[PDB]
Design a protein around this ligand. Sequence first.
Ligand code: HEC
Length: 103
Amino acid sequence: GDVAKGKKTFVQKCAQCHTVENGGKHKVGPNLWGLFGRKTGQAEGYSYTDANKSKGIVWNNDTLMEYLENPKKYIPGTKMIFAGIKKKGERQDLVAYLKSATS
Ligand code: HEC
């Protein structure tokens, strides 16, 4: 996807609850550094819901694309209160930025 477009999407819709940098602080949600290739709910020091911790899947392009379309549907009981990015293209650009900014 388009990393530059994804960044603006992140700043507009995710930044209020997330940081991406290495050593980043947990805000409402967990810092996202090292997200790709890691199982759900593994950010150090963040108190996840049992649901986010128990999902058991590995975060990558396919799982993130599905999750971000409708967070609560993918992880029922999650405390991430966000409706989701409905447009596929916008979601792909965001994933591209996420992959570039979290490693
Ligand atoms: C606050 C109002 C939030 C907004 C806006 C977004 N997210 Fe979030 N996210 C938030 C919380 C409180 C949590 C933990 C939920 C739980 O049940 O424990 C999360 C979690 C995620 C995750 C999973 C991280 C992991 O499993 O380690 C991801 C991938 C994530 N959030 C991504 C994300 C993106 C890209 C957002 C913008 C589109 C976004 N979140 C917004 C709270 C909030």
